[model samples]
Target: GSFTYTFVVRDENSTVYAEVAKILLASGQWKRLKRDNPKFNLMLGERNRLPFGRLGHEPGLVQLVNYYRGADKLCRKASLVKLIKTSPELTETCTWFPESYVIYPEREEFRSSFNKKKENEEGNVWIAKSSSGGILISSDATELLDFIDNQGQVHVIQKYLESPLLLEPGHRKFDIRSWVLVDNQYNIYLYREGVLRTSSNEMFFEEFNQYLVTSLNINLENSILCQIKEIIRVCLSCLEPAISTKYLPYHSFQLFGFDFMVDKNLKVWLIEVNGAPACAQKLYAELCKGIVDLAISSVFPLNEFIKL
Candidate 1:
């Protein structure tokens, strides 16, 4: 059997170039693994062993873990409020979002509280909720509740983040998409450069109804970028036990997309982590190149090929 590996490289100005290599396999071993280059090793690390979708990718689960580790204060406040139905101590950490609750179909108390708050606000509040599907926002309590009831499972009721930082006057909301790589040996790499994703429609404080249009046009502030890096490092450290247990060394490597948003107050909050983030052309070309370069250095000795 034979397979081909493609390597794409992008320069500073967004221009791209590609390199391809072919490998032959026989008797479960690689033969003629190196054709153009000598001393190349195919013993690369495995990808995404942490069950990112099952654990790290879920907003609810990630927030829950952050709260448990005392790192939730660094990001937007979150909680598995529905979990409180069984464990009362599972209370929320921050009230930044519109007053919200998580509820199940049979939780009458939760349902009543959510309705009472909605009524008291006279529908002035910007309501939002999320399930396995995604998030939805509206001012209509009845409509939102209807969606929740249909789920027939636990749901997170959150107040909409109405004051997201915008790119320009009356422009769409924007967020930072950062990358993190974890090697099989538990080495963590944080890519400093990230792309910003801006919403296409005019800014809407009342609802999230636009698709994000991404670009590499704007650069994030230094302080906020530092904070983002710190947050990811701490979160990964806190999750080391579980992650290491599931993704044993020498078998896996994972790349994560850490999405963050800045509020009107200049505060940074972690929106979510992408398990399998899409690598859009030009948008993430530099990031992909960095990953490839790092993997090559980690797996093979290219240094010996270079002479001083």
Candidate 2:
């Protein structure tokens, strides 16, 4: 038999539940609980037999609380250096954010101040969202001014890299993801997934070092997977909890997704962390099923499964 219920539990601070409850109460289908009214809307019912526990409090919740907070906090902290831009004014302040693409307002003006040498003319001068990009290249100073002048929203412009580093394999661009878990004892757990990204227009970083152009249309490769695993091994070796004080508090939190990029210096930058990772069956294979099984066994008692 199927069950039906509605609840929003991304965070203890979310007001969406109260709002919806108000709407239901207005429609006379439900009533609010009140302290003064002794019996007001309070009733006991049978417990749910679902396979999972509460949403936000449990692992099943897709809310990227750690990822959002970590990314935003880092960005804000970085902005204080007079490099990155302040928070965008366009959207509402995010809470327990899942996926996002943020662009600071002053990024465009910041890039315009950079006077590129004549020899570096072929390099990129601006960086905008892959979705917002209109023309591939905005050309010289006059072209950049014209492009932004007619634009409705702000764009980011930065000094372009001249000698772009190329991925070992002849791919245009590359993407990488790393998974991790934190236990109750504050022990850190890491899972490294194969890299997922598109090849560069050409493998040479010098060709397109303007904005890190990302494409949703990803190209998965075995060679890239090997590279991702190697990076994970090295990063963990250098940043393991045993050696670092920063990761000590994350013991109780399990599961994380880390994005990365390798610069011309061959240095790895930790991009972001995802708390509730997606179950990519094709990529994870039996490992995905193993994780799901572990979750099921933890939330549901053995007797129930045996009875079925």
Candidate 3:
């Protein structure tokens, strides 16, 4: 048995703007899938089966995949550190993230490090509540100890990125957000352009603030862009095998949003990977357009479909 159908897309006004017809077969007819759309058109038919499965929507799944691939920021940094230790050649290209240590209340010795003041303490260390979204800069050992004692929570002590690439005038820190798509066959596609988000407040060496403003205006060197693409490719390759083994074959496709930060020297850093990236109104429209275009060209090539 086989099937044929038409797919269309619409805008907020509900007016159809794009359409395509496709056919599926049970026998040898895979060649019908080409690389481009055809000129002839046909009537729309009954809807086809929709893509299924979680399709990489869970953050925990994303974290697990990244953890295995060393794509997570901490893991990636550790890998680079290991590589640098063995091969001096990569030392220049490899950059380490600010120092970080995960501390628990049961470990009193680790807590003592925070309890005692060290020389040149200002702007050196930051205490962040793990599983929560708040950061406190340690002005002195006493201040940090007080916060830890009062809050009594498992915290991650980190050496903050004091020298971040900042926007002009405002001196706000910024990061890049890029998208990646993977098909059922494990084929991957990385969008060339990416959106940028900048901190809302002026960058300060002595304060901790959380705010971001997103914009389409940003630029990256070709070398940096290529590096970023390669990193994403490696990360996706790690995820493909796990997803294929655990999910249905016809789940069709999955998309991911990769967040990254570039330092003053243009050294790229992996901030995180968002499995279920939020599609704001403007971003959603762009994604819809991009996905429709990709589906028509790659998955449902019109060149092979005959007009009814």
Write model 3 residue lDDT over 27-104, tens digit each, in one string.
Answer: 123222221222111111111221123223433222011111212321233332333334443334334333445544
Alpha-carbon deviation at 166 in model 3, angstroms: 1.4
Instruction: Name the regions of candidate 1 deviating beyond 4 angstroms.
Output: 1-134, 139-143, 152-154, 201-219, 245-249, 300-308
lDDT tens string, model 2, 1-308? 12221222222332322333344343343344442222222111111221122213333322111221222222221221221122342113221121122233333444434344445654445433222235324436555544555664544333333333344435344545555443222334444333344563212222223233342122232323334444434333323333332433211123445565554544344334443444444445433433223322222223220100
Off by over 4 Å in 3: 1-123, 127-133, 137-158, 201-219, 246-249, 280-283, 293-308
The root-mean-square deviation over C-alpha atoms between each candidate and the true structure, in angstroms, is 11.9, 14.3, 12.5
User: Any idea what lDDT model 2 has?
Assistant: 0.34
Overall lDDT per candidate, in order of appearance: 0.45, 0.34, 0.43
- As a TM-score, model 3 comes out at 0.50
lDDT of 2 at 159: 36
| Best-matching candidate per lDDT | 1
Candidate 2 stretches greater than 4 Å from native: 1-113, 116-124, 130-154, 158-164, 167-171, 181-188, 200-257, 269-281, 285-308
TM-score of 1: 0.55
Kindly give the stretch of ten consecutive residues in candidate 3 with the minimal lDDT sum.
Answer: 62-71
lDDT of 3: 0.43
Q: Estimated TM-score per prediction?
A: 0.55, 0.38, 0.50
By TM-score: ranked, best first: 1, 3, 2
